[PDB]
């Protein structure tokens, strides 16, 4: 028979370097090494170097996890997808070698694809709409024309950064997100923030500046912090609702560092009841960058016959998700 087909995934687009291992029915292994810049904001050259030194130990601790023999790995999927050049080349290289070292095939995966497919996998969704909310990414994507199509998006700032550049203007350690999350709790009143949805696209610069101007005005912070969430998540809840009843589907998935917000999850599962369609809240841990979500998106590619000899492979920091054919829904 055809033995349970096993893959190993390498994620390394931004700051997270992770390696996963799965097969059709299993999730044999997976751990990451996040580059933690106490500073804050993008730090490309520093990131690659982080990786470069721990990529060694991730892919190797993993094998131990899966407790599978090294011979047992069949495919090798890395994240050639969108991201930071220094990091992508580090991952790309590392893979191009492991493929040789272990003597098996290899394919380049697209990054956000992995977020969909791993989330889709983890929940059992057949053809959902996706809410990509990571660093500088505010994406709402869906499988429509035999490929994953991006419908709406932020025209200025990824929701995640607007969040952090307020914390880093309201004097707060770069653990910005959650610090403002468990801060909007004690928010008493709702101030006014520029609500900008237009089609399925959004803008966030407006929110920020109007929020900073309120800040120096000497307003509350719990109030500002509270208002910004309800105002921006309001903007996503609308766009979502729309994305659904445009490409006509009955399911949702949240992927990203932003997607770990306790109140955002609520405002979504709530829209679920009112839309009449399932709000699969993916495993609270698979929301950040992981190597294994790569393995999952590769598995699917190879299984549908898509293959690529080593030479063809090369990073692409500008990798459109609708550039890859996804013929399996």
């Amino acid at each position: 028979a055809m033995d349970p087909m096993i893959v190993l995934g390498l994620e390394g687009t931004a700051h997270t370097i992770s390696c996963g291992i799965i097969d059709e029915s299993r999730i044999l292994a997976m751990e990451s090494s996040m580059y933690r810049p106490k500073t804050g904001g993008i730090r490309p050259l520093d990131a690659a170097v982080h990786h470069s030194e721990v990529i060694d130990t991730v892919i190797s601790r993993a094998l131990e996890k899966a407790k599978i023999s090294i011979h047992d790995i069949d495919l090798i999927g890395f994240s050639m997808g969108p991201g930071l050049a220094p990091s992508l080349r580090v991952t790309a290289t590392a893979a191009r070698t492991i493929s040789v070292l272990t003597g098996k095939p290899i394919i380049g995966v697209n990054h956000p694809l992995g977020h969909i497919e791993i989330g889709r996998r983890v929940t059992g969704a057949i053809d959902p709409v996706m809410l990509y909310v990571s660093g500088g990414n505010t994406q709402v994507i869906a499988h429509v024309n035999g490929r994953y199509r991006v419908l709406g998006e932020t025209l200025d700032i990824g929701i995640g950064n607007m969040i952090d550049k307020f914390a880093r203007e309201a004097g707060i350690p770069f653990p910005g997100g959650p610090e403002i999350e468990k801060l909007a709790m004690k928010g008493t009143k709702l101030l006014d923030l520029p609500y900008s949805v237009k089609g399925m696209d959004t803008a966030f610069s407006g929110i920020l500046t109007a929020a900073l101007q309120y800040l120096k005005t000497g307003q509350a912070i719990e109030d500002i912090s509270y208002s910004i969430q309800e105002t921006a998540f309001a903007m996503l809840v609308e766009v979502l609702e729309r994305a659904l009843y445009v490409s006509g589907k009955d399911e949702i998935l949240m992927a990203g560092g932003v997607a770990l917000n306790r109140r955002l999850r609520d405002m979504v599962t709530n829209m679920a009841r009112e839309a009449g369609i399932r709000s699969y809240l993916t495993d609270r841990e698979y929301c950040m960058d992981n190597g294994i979500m790569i393995a999952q998106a590769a598995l699917l590619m190879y299984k549908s016959g898509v293959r690529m000899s080593v030479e063809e492979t090369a990073v692409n920091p500008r990798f459109r998700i609708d550039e890859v054919d996804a013929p399996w829904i």
């Binding site: 470069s52 080349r89 580090v90 790309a92 290289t93 590392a94 070698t97 492991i98 040789v100 030479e311």
Partner: protein, 77 residues
């Protein structure tokens, strides 16, 4: 203009082969040079030959490649 030349020896001649290959794909991959590099394989030893305008340019290029080779090396190991 600056001038650079790096050489690192590997235990065996085949390890050299592997690392060369791995990184060679990356060499070719790059669109924009911030300097001119010459890639070569020797015995069990890879050779780098760089020509940059200033010292800030050359530096970044080195960092790249040296990071790539440490990637290949460590995987093999």
């Amino acid at each position: 203009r600056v001038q650079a030349k790096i050489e690192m020896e590997f235990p065996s001649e085949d390890v050299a082969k592997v690392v060369y290959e791995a990184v060679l794909y990356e060499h070719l991959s790059v669109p924009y040079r911030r300097s001119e590099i010459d890639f070569k394989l020797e015995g069990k030893k890879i050779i780098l030959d760089i020509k940059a305008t200033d010292s800030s340019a050359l530096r970044g290029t080195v960092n790249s490649y040296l990071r790539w080779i440490k990637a290949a090396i460590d995987v093999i190991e």
